[PDB]
Amino acid sequence: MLGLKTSIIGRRVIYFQEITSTNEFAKTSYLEEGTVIVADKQTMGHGRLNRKWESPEGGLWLSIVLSPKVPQKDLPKIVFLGAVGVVETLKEFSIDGRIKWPNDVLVNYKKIAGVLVEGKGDKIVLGIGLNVNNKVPNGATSMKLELGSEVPLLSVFRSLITNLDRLYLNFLKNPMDILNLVRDNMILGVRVKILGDGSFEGIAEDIDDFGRLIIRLDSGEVKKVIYGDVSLRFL
Amino acid sequence: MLGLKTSIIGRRVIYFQEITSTNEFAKTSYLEEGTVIVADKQTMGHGRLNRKWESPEGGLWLSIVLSPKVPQKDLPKIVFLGAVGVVETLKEFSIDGRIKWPNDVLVNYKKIAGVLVEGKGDKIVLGIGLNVNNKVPNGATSMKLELGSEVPLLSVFRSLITNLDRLYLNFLKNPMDILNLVRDNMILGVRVKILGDGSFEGIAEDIDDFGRLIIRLDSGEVKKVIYGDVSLRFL
Ligand SMILES: Nc1ncnc2c1ncn2[C@@H]1O[C@H](COP(=O)(O)OP(=O)(O)O)[C@@H](O)[C@H]1O
Ligand SMILES: Nc1ncnc2c1ncn2[C@@H]1O[C@H](COP(=O)(O)OP(=O)(O)O)[C@@H](O)[C@H]1O
Domain containing residue A231: CATH number: 2.30.30.100
Question: Which residues have C-beta within 8 Å of that of residue A157, sequence separation ≥ 6?
Answer: A38, A60, A62, B1
Q: Show Cβ contacts of residue A123 under 8 Å, excluding neighbours closer than 6 positions.
A: A27, A65, A66, A67
Pocket mutation for ligand 1, best pick of A53, A79, A99, A138 (most atoms within 8 Å of C-beta): A53
DSSP string, A35-77: -EEEES-BSS-B-TTS-B--B-TTSEEEEEEE-----TTTGGG
Residue from A21, A41, A43, A49 to probe ligand 1 pocket by mutation (most atoms less than 8 Å from CB): A49
Domain of B15 in residue numbering reads as: 1-187
Q: Quick one: closest CA in B to A151, which residue?
A: B1
Same domain assignment for residues A112 and A222:
no
Cβ atoms of residues A134 and A142 within 8 Å: yes
Give the number of the atom of ligand 1 that is nearest the alpha carbon of residue A134.
1
Interval between CA B52 and ligand 2 midpoint (Å): 7
B54 Cβ closer than 6 Å to some ligand 2 atom:
yes
Whether residue B100 is annotated as binding a ligand: the answer is yes
What is the rounded CA–CA span in Å between residue A215 and residue B230? 76
CATH code of the domain covering residue A74: 3.30.930.10
- Ligand 1 centre and the CA of A177: distance in Å? 28
Contact B76, B175 (CB under 8 A): no
Q: Report the C-alpha gap between B147 and B217 in whole angstroms.
A: 38
Letter string b/e over residues B146-173, b meaning 16 or more CB atoms within 10 A of that residue's CB:
beeeebebeebbbbbbbbbbebbeebee
Q: End-to-end CA distance of chain A, in Å?
A: 48
Q: Are A21 and A42 within 8 A, CB to CB? A: yes
Q: Do B16 and A11 touch (CB under 8 A)?
A: yes
Which one of A11, A14, A15, A40 would you mutate to disrupt binding with B, by most B Cβ within 10 Å of its Cβ? Answer: A15
Ligand 1 pocket residues where CB is under 6 Å: A 47-49, 51-54, 111, 114, 131, 136-137, 140, 231
Q: How many CB atoms lie within 10 A of CB A224?
A: 11
Subunit contact A14:B16, Cβ cutoff 8 A: no
Test site for ligand 2: of B107, B111, B233, most ligand atoms within 8 A of the Cβ: B111
Same domain, B25 and B104: yes
Paired sense of beta strands B213-216 and B110-120, if any: unpaired
* Atom of ligand 2 minimally distant from the CA of B114: 17
Is A64 in CB contact (< 8 Å) with chain B?
Answer: no
Statement to judge: residues A29 and A93 lie in one domain: yes
CB B64 within 8 A of CB B6: no
Domain shared by B181 and B199, yes or no: no
CA distances from A113 to A90, A105, A149, A150, B63 (A): 10, 5, 18, 17, 34
Do A41 and A57 touch, CB atoms closer than 8 A? yes
Same domain, B27 and B85: yes
Cite the DSSP H helix spans in chain B: 22-28, 78-92, 143-147, 153-173, 177-184
A68 prior amide bond cis, ω within 30: no
Q: B144-153: long-range contacts (C-beta < 8 A, 24 or more apart)?
A: B144/B58, B146/B95, B146/B107, B146/B112, B147/B93, B147/B94, B147/B95, B151/B93, B153/A1, B153/A3, B153/B58, B153/B60
Residues A152 and A229 in one domain: no
Pair B143, B233 in one domain:
no
Total of domains in chain A = 2
Picking from A3, A130, A19, A10, the residue whose alpha carbon sits closest to that of residue A65 is A10
Same domain, B32 and B142: yes
Give the C-alpha distances (Å, rounded to integers) separating B84 from A25, A144, A195, B98, B160. 35, 39, 61, 9, 10
- Within an 8 Å CB–CB cutoff, is residue A4 touching chain B? yes
User: Phi and psi (nearest 5°) for B78?
Assistant: -60, -40
Binary contact (B1, A57; C-beta < 8 A)? no
User: Residues of B with CB below 8 A from A17's CB?
Assistant: 4, 6, 10-12
C-alpha A87/C-alpha A185 separation (Å) is 8
Domain-terminating residue out of B187, B208, B226: B187
- Please count the residue pairs, one from chain A and one from chain B, whose beta carbons lie less than 8 angstroms apart: 66
CB contact under 8 A, B40 and A2: yes
From the CA of A111, give the closest atom in ligand 1: 4
**A117 shares its domain with A130:** yes
Nearest to B15 among A1, A5, A156 (CB): A1
How far is the C-alpha of B83 from the C-alpha of B181, rounded, in Å?
10
A157 touches chain B (CB under 8 A): yes
In a shared domain, residues B193 and B174: no
- B71 to chain A, minimum CA–CA distance in Å? 29
Q: Are residues B171 and B195 in the same domain?
A: no
B197: three-class secondary structure by DSSP: coil
B148 and B101 in a single domain? The answer is: yes
